[PDB]
Design a protein around this motif. Structure first.
Motif, PDB file in Angstrom:
ATOM      1  N   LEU A  50       0.726  -1.880  -0.407  1.00  0.00           N
ATOM      2  CA  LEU A  50       0.380  -0.087   0.083  1.00  0.00           C
ATOM      3  C   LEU A  50       1.052   1.366   0.039  1.00  0.00           C
ATOM      4  O   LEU A  50       1.690   1.060   0.447  1.00  0.00           O
ATOM      5  CB  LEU A  50      -0.815  -0.225   0.939  1.00  0.00           C
ATOM      6  CG  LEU A  50      -1.764  -1.079   1.179  1.00  0.00           C
ATOM      7  CD1 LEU A  50      -3.020  -0.941   2.349  1.00  0.00           C
ATOM      8  CD2 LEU A  50      -2.650  -0.809   0.103  1.00  0.00           C
ATOM      9  N   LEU A  51       0.465   2.050  -0.105  1.00  0.00           N
ATOM     10  CA  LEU A  51       1.209   3.861  -0.808  1.00  0.00           C
ATOM     11  C   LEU A  51       0.280   4.781   0.973  1.00  0.00           C
ATOM     12  O   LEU A  51      -0.508   3.913   1.516  1.00  0.00           O
ATOM     13  CB  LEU A  51       0.411   3.973  -1.495  1.00  0.00           C
ATOM     14  CG  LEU A  51       1.251   3.572  -3.183  1.00  0.00           C
ATOM     15  CD1 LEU A  51       0.038   4.784  -4.377  1.00  0.00           C
ATOM     16  CD2 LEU A  51       2.547   3.904  -3.390  1.00  0.00           C
ATOM     17  N   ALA A  52       1.131   5.713   0.693  1.00  0.00           N
ATOM     18  CA  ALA A  52       0.274   6.778   1.624  1.00  0.00           C
ATOM     19  C   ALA A  52      -1.220   7.188   1.201  1.00  0.00           C
ATOM     20  O   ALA A  52      -1.567   7.459   2.814  1.00  0.00           O
ATOM     21  CB  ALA A  52       1.290   8.143   1.347  1.00  0.00           C
ATOM     22  N   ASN A  53      -1.451   7.114   0.532  1.00  0.00           N
ATOM     23  CA  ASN A  53      -3.032   7.241   0.422  1.00  0.00           C
ATOM     24  C   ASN A  53      -3.676   5.587   0.907  1.00  0.00           C
ATOM     25  O   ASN A  53      -5.113   5.714   0.226  1.00  0.00           O
ATOM     26  CB  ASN A  53      -3.724   7.879  -1.340  1.00  0.00           C
ATOM     27  CG  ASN A  53      -2.162   6.463  -1.985  1.00  0.00           C
ATOM     28  OD1 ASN A  53      -2.255   5.009  -1.636  1.00  0.00           O
ATOM     29  ND2 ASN A  53      -1.763   6.766  -3.266  1.00  0.00           N
ATOM     30  N   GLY A  54      -3.268   5.288   0.574  1.00  0.00           N
ATOM     31  CA  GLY A  54      -3.907   3.402   1.345  1.00  0.00           C
ATOM     32  C   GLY A  54      -4.447   2.905   0.179  1.00  0.00           C
ATOM     33  O   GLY A  54      -4.967   1.458   0.283  1.00  0.00           O
TER      34      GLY A  54
END
Ligand code: NI
Ligand code: NI
Length: 221
Positions: free
Chosen positions: A123-127
Motif C-alpha cells: 500500500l501507498l501513503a494514500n492507502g
C-alpha cells in the motif's frame, strides 16, 4: 511502500511477486534460479510467482511460475513473530535474464546508520495499491533502540530499519520483500506497528545474516 517512488523498471530483478486468485498478497526474493526466499507468514499450499515484473498481470520476458513446494523455518513464530522466513522451490528453474536475476544474501549482520533499499507492491501513503513497483530508502536502526521499543517481541532474528521523520517504511503487501544493503540482501519485510509510516517506529525485518547456513542446507536437500 510508504513515501517511495516508482522503481526504475527492472532495477530489482530479484523481486518476486506472490499472487493468488489474480491477487497479490506477499513478495519474495530470488536467491537461486529455482528458489525464492520469502517471509514465513506468506506461506501458501501452492504459489503463483511473478518474475521480471514492474506492472502486474504487460511486460515481455516476464515469467509466471508455479510452485507447490515451500519450507518455513522450523522455529517460525517461536517465539512470537520470530524467524519469519521460508524457502519456495519453483517447479522449473528460471532462465535468468536482464529483468530476472538472483541476489546473494549478506554475510555481515546489519550495520547501524546504513542507508538501505526496500521494494514492493504494498500500500501507498494514500492507502491504495500501486500500478508500478515501488522503491524507497530506509536506514538501519541501532539494536538497543530496536530492542527497547519492540520489547517483548524483539528477537535476534530481527533488526529494525526506518522509523525516520521522512516516514519511509514498508506496509501491507510489502511482506516478504527485500531489504537491500550494499548490493546484498540484508533482510525481508516482516512486520511493524500499525499504521505504516509512523515517526519513531522503524519497520522490523528478518535478520538473514542469522540463517545463511540454514538456507544453504535447505537448498542442498
Ligand atoms: Ni519493462
Ligand atoms: Ni506481513
Amino acid at each position: 511502500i510508504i513515501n517511495g517512488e516508482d522503481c526504475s523498471p527492472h532495477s530489482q530483478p530479484w523481486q518476486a511477486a506472490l499472487v493468488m486468485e489474480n491477487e497479490l498478497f506477499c513478495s519474495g526474493v530470488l536467491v537461486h534460479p529455482q528458489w525464492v526466499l520469502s517471509a514465513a507468514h506468506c506461506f501458501q499450499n501452492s504459489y503463483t510467482i511473478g518474475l521480471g515484473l514492474h506492472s502486474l498481470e504487460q511486460e515481455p520476458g516476464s515469467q509466471m511460475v508455479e510452485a507447490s513446494l515451500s519450507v518455513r523455518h522450523p522455529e517460525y513464530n517461536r517465539p512470537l513473530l520470530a524467524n519469519d522466513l521460508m524457502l519456495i522451490k519453483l517447479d522449473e528453474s528460471v532462465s535468468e535474464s536482464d529483468t530476472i536475476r538472483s541476489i546473494s544474501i549478506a554475510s555481515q549482520c546489519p550495520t547501524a546508520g546504513n542507508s538501505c533499499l526496500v521494494s514492493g507492491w504494498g500500500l501507498l501513503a494514500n492507502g491504495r495499491m500501486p500500478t508500478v513497483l515501488q522503491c524507497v530508502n530506509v536506514s538501519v536502526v541501532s539494536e538497543e533502540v530496536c530492542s527497547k521499543l519492540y520489547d517483548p517481541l524483539y528477537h535476534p532474528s530481527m533488526f529494525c530499519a526506518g522509523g525516520g521523520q521522512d516516514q519511509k517504511d514498508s506496509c501491507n503487501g510489502d511482506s516478504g520483500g527485500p531489504l537491500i544493503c550494499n548490493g546484498y540482501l540484508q533482510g525481508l519485510v516482516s512486520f511493524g506497528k500499525a499504521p505504516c509510516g509512523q515517526v519513531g517506529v522503524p519497520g522490523v525485518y528478518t535478520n538473514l545474516c542469522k540463517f545463511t547456513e540454514w538456507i544453504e542446507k535447505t537448498v542442498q536437500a
